[PDB]
Design a protein around this nucleic acid. Structure first.
Ligand SMILES: [Mg+2]
Ligand SMILES: [Mg+2]
Ligand SMILES: [Mg+2]
Ligand SMILES: [Mg+2]
Ligand SMILES: [Mg+2]
Ligand SMILES: [Mg+2]
Ligand SMILES: [Mg+2]
Ligand SMILES: [Mg+2]
Ligand SMILES: [Mg+2]
Ligand SMILES: [Mg+2]
Ligand SMILES: [Mg+2]
Ligand SMILES: [Mg+2]
Ligand SMILES: [Mg+2]
Ligand SMILES: [Mg+2]
Ligand SMILES: [Mg+2]
Ligand SMILES: [Mg+2]
Ligand SMILES: [Mg+2]
Ligand SMILES: [Mg+2]
Ligand SMILES: [Mg+2]
Ligand SMILES: [Mg+2]
Ligand SMILES: [Mg+2]
Ligand SMILES: [Mg+2]
Ligand SMILES: [Mg+2]
Ligand SMILES: [Mg+2]
Ligand SMILES: [Mg+2]
Ligand SMILES: [Mg+2]
Lengths: 155, 150, 144, 129
RNA sequence: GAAUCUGGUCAAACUUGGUCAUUUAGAGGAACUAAAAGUCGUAACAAGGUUUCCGUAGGUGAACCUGCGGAAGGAUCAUUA
RNA sequence: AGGGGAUCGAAGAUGAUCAGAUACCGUCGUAGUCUUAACCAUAAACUAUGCCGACUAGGGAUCGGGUGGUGUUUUUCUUAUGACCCACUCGGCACCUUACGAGAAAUCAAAGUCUUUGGGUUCUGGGGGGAGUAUGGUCGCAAGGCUGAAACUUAAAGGAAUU
RNA sequence: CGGUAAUUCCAGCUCCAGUAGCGUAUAUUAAAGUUGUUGCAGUUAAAAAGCUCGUAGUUGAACUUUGGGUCUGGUUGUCCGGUCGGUUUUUCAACCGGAUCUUUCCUUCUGGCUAACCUGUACUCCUUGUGGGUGCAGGCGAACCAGGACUUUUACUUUGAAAAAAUUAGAGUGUUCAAAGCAGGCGAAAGCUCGAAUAUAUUAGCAUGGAAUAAUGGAAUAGGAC
RNA sequence: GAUAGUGGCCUACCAUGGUUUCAACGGGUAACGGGGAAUAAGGGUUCGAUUCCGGAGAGGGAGCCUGAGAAACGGCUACCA
């Protein structure tokens, strides 16, 4: 998520082993490293052009997307740089030949390359453990604008 | 079979088979549209306008002649109200009840009725939010409701 | 109609409802509360050994009349006191005070048998030897 | 609320048959219902049926020969898994020789025999004999 | 490079309290069941000899009785004009 | 807790009746009955029949509305209403006769369209007692309410009909 | 059952059942449609909340490509055994597919191989021929890849891949039979040789075919599509 | 910082989140989990300490040495019993 400033805390935040030689002056002035995650997913222009940092970004950081790729609706954005994803499914109870509606919340990491509101459907990829509960990293946000084009009813 | 009473009635208008304009009716769709617009300007709700059309003029149904429903037409011209008509009416009704209650307190039947009305309004509100006719946060209370009414 | 929900996604309700209902079925209740361990003189076991306190004749319920010849026993495992019927015509004079006795249930699953009121247990073995054996004169009681 | 239309139709048909009538008036009318009727027709449980256009939902007039002794929907459309069809057949049908379990598969609406032949399965609908 | 030793760290345990859980003595008290040749009536079943019930309140030796409202599971499917 | 307090009347007095009779019957009679602010949340709060929807069988009634009758009367001349009269129609409170369906039967146009078993749903029951008790919550100023056991006990308790 | 004829006690004799076994106790399963998803009850037997509102839950009208035709693969019945109890076609069938054409795209190209003739460049090895093919500039690409470009998202169902062995179902096999075991079998009885199969488990994940059913999404300040 | 390495695993500074009527949390289990077992129309119900596979533990709790591998107990150190 980030939210403004970039150079905002006690330590200088830089991409490790990326050097921006302060003698021969470049076009970008500071070199930005990125990679494409693969699996058919696309690295956004917000990630390449941006000034944000993140070690835990799947594009500009050090984590690698591998294993399971899940999808679900966003429940909570409140905690910084991460998210909560609800993941509705049907559990088959065999005795009654019917289905229970079930739940399971997946906490996931949000790269500051994304604008995520509560209720957006999000594609999330598995990676190396990031915190106590997080194993997943947001790859694609599917709800793009909602109705930000024509919000007002007047023709 | 009704929504808040034990009532079971089936009284309703029965729309005819033919979508096409009735053979006896002349005029023009444009004319009809103009009339509708005029009515809207004057300050009438869709239903009222429709009724007027049915009665004073040769209009059976607006969709039969023009190709569009009255509300749609209103919207197109930029005349459809801030609150949908039915909802507004409901709100007004609720307000009246509230006013009555304010005056006389021991009317328990009235109070009961008010609750029903409120519930109905809430239902309608929910529907509207889902359809996004109302702004998706619009709530109904008391003072606010009164303000809306007036 | 029909009181239950039917819809293809009901499942949970069907489960929970069934669970709730199950508690009205007495055996199930017994199993789940564990009343075989907490209450009941035998600790949910098929047999129990006890020490004979005294020999008590018990008057049967109605239609019938006869002194039944039972024994007041205190069980070794917990210390609970129970009445135990001594089967067959002689047999009561095989028992004696301060004697170790092996008691089974009566055959009603905790309930009292026939006409003998408040008695839920048989006497099977006195001082290590079967009552039946004694009765048939196949073995002898090896003192106490 | 009219929760199931097909069910209603089937019940009506059953009622008509039991009382000995030679024709029914089904009132809401759907695609599914029509398909069901067609299956019956094919198997000869029903005569000529016709769809009145109301410009709203529909209305079906069905001729009954008298051979149909029970329709019947099985309501919460259970997902039947090929090897499971047999069990259903055993349950619902009065014999092993005749009668049909109508089940909606992705290959279309058909009787169980047809499904077997085609090697498809899906959700159950109803039964006829 | 041993004894020894300064700070940590993990941390068994111990002293006095508090707390939750399960047990356990238990002066007394209030129950219910079983056995149904004790005592006082006869409450209910017949219009049960004041029709029964029910909610509730009071009263009583005990069934119970008496208000106020209700119900036939009532002893009435019944009085046109 | 105020106001009201005519009647009727738990308690009480009190006169009979009875072996007893602080019971029925008689005469009085505080509280209550009425009301204003609070509370209470239960009744055989019963149609002892949950709600929504579809379909199956006739028959008259009746209430509310609406249609068509050169139908009757009203009369201030046509009238126009109104009230009737007939016929149809939706909605209601019911009822009558048959069930070809149900059901243990009493009975039921639903209590029908269920071993030819699946329209959608909420709640409740699982032998009789113990017991709507014990306990723990919780709500009540209180009476109480909602929630609610077990040990133990027992071969029956019950339903509808029969002579 | 037993209070003086006890078919029920205690014995004797007969007889019945199971039998190297049979009884008793306590669980537990079937019986139990007495836990009910299949599949129960609730007017009177236990049971419909006093009544209404109401969030979750469960459930929820109908409606978008249907119809035709043209060929073309099978697969069993038939029509004879055309045959040395088995095997090949036709007269024929229903049944399951495939390609199309019907106002029809089935994701689209940036290219690789364009298999093939839509071809026609010399026209003929040659029965009087449009039987047949040495043969290459324009070019049908589905015969496959290797890369984009993004693909409404499910539930459901399909075939496949995985669900250790033992256990279970089950093929083979005279442990003398059987429970078992994975052995064995055939010789000249000089050495040779079958074996040690298959099938299940559905919950979840993976793969693919399907597009009925059930849901979701798109163009209404068009900031829509080419 | 620590670790073989990921990680509130721990530390500092900061933010206020995370889970929950689709039962969180708590309580119970006379609970090791599974393969499986008993029953046996179909659906189920009950059991699985136990020969195979996982996991724990060596009276209870800690703490470590040696080592590729142990927080080992037919190794050691302590405390409690
Ligand atoms: Mg209706
Ligand atoms: Mg409603
Ligand atoms: Mg009496
Ligand atoms: Mg009396
Ligand atoms: Mg009763
Ligand atoms: Mg008195
Ligand atoms: Mg007196
Ligand atoms: Mg008096
Ligand atoms: Mg009540
Ligand atoms: Mg009731
Ligand atoms: Mg009971
Ligand atoms: Mg009776
Ligand atoms: Mg004798
Ligand atoms: Mg059982
Ligand atoms: Mg029952
Ligand atoms: Mg009852
Ligand atoms: Mg639908
Ligand atoms: Mg086997
Ligand atoms: Mg344990
Ligand atoms: Mg277990
Ligand atoms: Mg185990
Ligand atoms: Mg154990
Ligand atoms: Mg030991
Ligand atoms: Mg150790
Ligand atoms: Mg040892
Ligand atoms: Mg060891």
């Amino acid at each position: 998520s980030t939210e403004l400033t970039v150079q905002s805390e006690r330590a200088f935040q830089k991409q490790p082993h990326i050097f921006t030689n302060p003698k021969a002056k470049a076009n970008r002035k500071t070199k930005r490293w990125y990679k494409n995650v693969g699996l058919g997913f696309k690295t956004p222009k917000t990630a390449i052009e941006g000034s944000y940092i993140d070690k835990k970004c799947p594009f500009t950081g050090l984590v690698s997307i591998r294993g399971k790729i899940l999808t679900g609706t966003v429940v909570s954005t409140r905690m910084h740089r991460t998210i909560v994803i609800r993941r509705d499914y049907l559990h088959y109870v065999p005795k009654y030949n019917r289905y229970e509606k079930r739940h399971k919340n997946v906490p996931a990491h949000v790269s500051p390359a994304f604008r995520v509101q509560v209720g957006d459907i999000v594609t999330v990829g598995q990676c190396r453990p990031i915190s106590k509960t997080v194993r997943f990293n947001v790859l694609k946000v599917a709800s793009a604008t909602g109705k930000a084009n024509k919000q007002f009813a007047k023709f | 079979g009704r929504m808040h009473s034990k009532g079971k009635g089936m009284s309703s208008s029965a729309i005819p088979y033919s979508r096409n304009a009735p053979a006896w009716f002349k005029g023009s769709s444009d004319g009809v549209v103009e009339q509708i617009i005029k009515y809207a300007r004057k300050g009438l709700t869709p239903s009222q306008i429709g009724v007027l059309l049915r009665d004073a003029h040769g209009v059976t149904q607006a969709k039969v002649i023009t190709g569009n429903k009255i509300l749609r037409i209103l919207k197109s011209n930029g005349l459809a109200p801030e609150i949908p008509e039915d909802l507004y009416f409901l709100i007004k009704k609720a307000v009246s009840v509230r006013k009555h209650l304010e005056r006389n307190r021991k009317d328990k039947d009235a109070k009961f009725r008010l609750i029903l009305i409120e519930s109905r309004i809430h239902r309608l509100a929910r529907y509207y939010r889902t359809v996004s006719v109302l702004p998706p946060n619009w709530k109904y209370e008391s003072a606010t409701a009164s303000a809306l009414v007036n | 109609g029909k009181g239950k929900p039917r819809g293809l996604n009901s499942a949970r309700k069907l489960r929970v409802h069934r669970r709730n209902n199950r508690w009205a079925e007495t055996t199930y209740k017994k199993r789940l509360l564990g009343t075989a361990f907490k209450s009941s003189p035998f600790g949910g076991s098929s047999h129990a050994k006890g020490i004979v306190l005294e020999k008590i004749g018990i008057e049967s319920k109605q239609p019938n009349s006869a002194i039944r010849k039972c024994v007041r026993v205190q069980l070794i495992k917990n210390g609970k006191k129970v009445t135990a019927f001594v089967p067959n015509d002689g047999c009561l004079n095989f028992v004696d005070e301060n004697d170790e006795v092996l008691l089974a249930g009566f055959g009603r699953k905790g309930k009292a048998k026939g006409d003998i009121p408040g008695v839920r247990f048989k006497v099977v073995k006195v001082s290590g030897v079967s009552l039946l054996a004694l009765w048939k004169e196949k073995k002898e009681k090896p003192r106490s | 609320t009219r929760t199931s239309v097909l069910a209603d139709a089937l019940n009506a048909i059953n009622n008509a048959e039991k009382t000995g009538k030679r024709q029914v008036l089904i009132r809401p009318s759907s695609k599914v219902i029509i398909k069901f009727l067609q299956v019956m027709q094919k198997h000869g449980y029903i005569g000529e049926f016709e769809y009145i256009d109301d410009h709203r939902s529909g209305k079906i007039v069905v001729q009954l020969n008298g051979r149909l002794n029970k329709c019947g929907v099985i309501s919460p459309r259970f997902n039947v898994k090929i090897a499971d069809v047999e069990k259903w057949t055993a349950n619902l049908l009065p014999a092993r020789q005749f009668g049909y379990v109508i089940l909606t598969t992705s290959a279309g609406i058909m009787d169980h025999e047809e499904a077997h032949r085609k090697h498809v399965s899906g959700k159950i609908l109803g039964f006829v004999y």
